[PDB]
């Protein structure tokens, strides 16, 4: 399932996000209700990481 980046950030800051598996521009997201989806980073977002960390999201990268 695919979700819009803006919606994803909305969920991040609405404290609904548990984990974010970032793979290049691809982010595999797990919600706090265990729902899983994939979203893509549209353009370089320097504010992304700090946003995830400030909202206590589990952040993971891939080989």
Told to check if 1 binds a copy of itself by CB under 8 A, we report no
Which of 31, 33, 32, 52 lies closest to 41 in space, CA to CA?
A: 52
Q: Please, which residue, 15 or 26, has the CB nearer to a copy of itself? A: 26
Q: x/- string (CB under 8 A) for a copy of itself, residues 18-57?
A: --x-x--xx------------xxxxxxxxxxxx-xx---x
Q: Please report, in angstroms and rounded to a whole number, the separation of the first and last CA atoms in the chain.
A: 23
- Considering the complex, what minimum distance in angstroms separates the CB of residue 19 from a copy of itself? 8
CA distance linking residue 29 with residue 36, whole number of Å? 6
Beta bridge partners of 4: none
Q: Under the rule (CB under 8 A), what is the footprint of a copy of itself? A: 4-7, 9, 20, 22, 25-26, 39-50, 52-53, 57-63
């Amino acid at each position: 399932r695919k979700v819009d980046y803006s919606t994803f950030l909305q969920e991040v800051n609405n404290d609904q996000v548990r984990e974010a598996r970032i793979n290049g521009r691809e982010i595999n997201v797990t919600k706090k209700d265990s729902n899983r989806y994939t979203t893509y980073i549209p353009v370089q977002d320097p504010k992304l990481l700090d946003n995830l960390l400030t909202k206590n999201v589990k952040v993971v990268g891939e080989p």
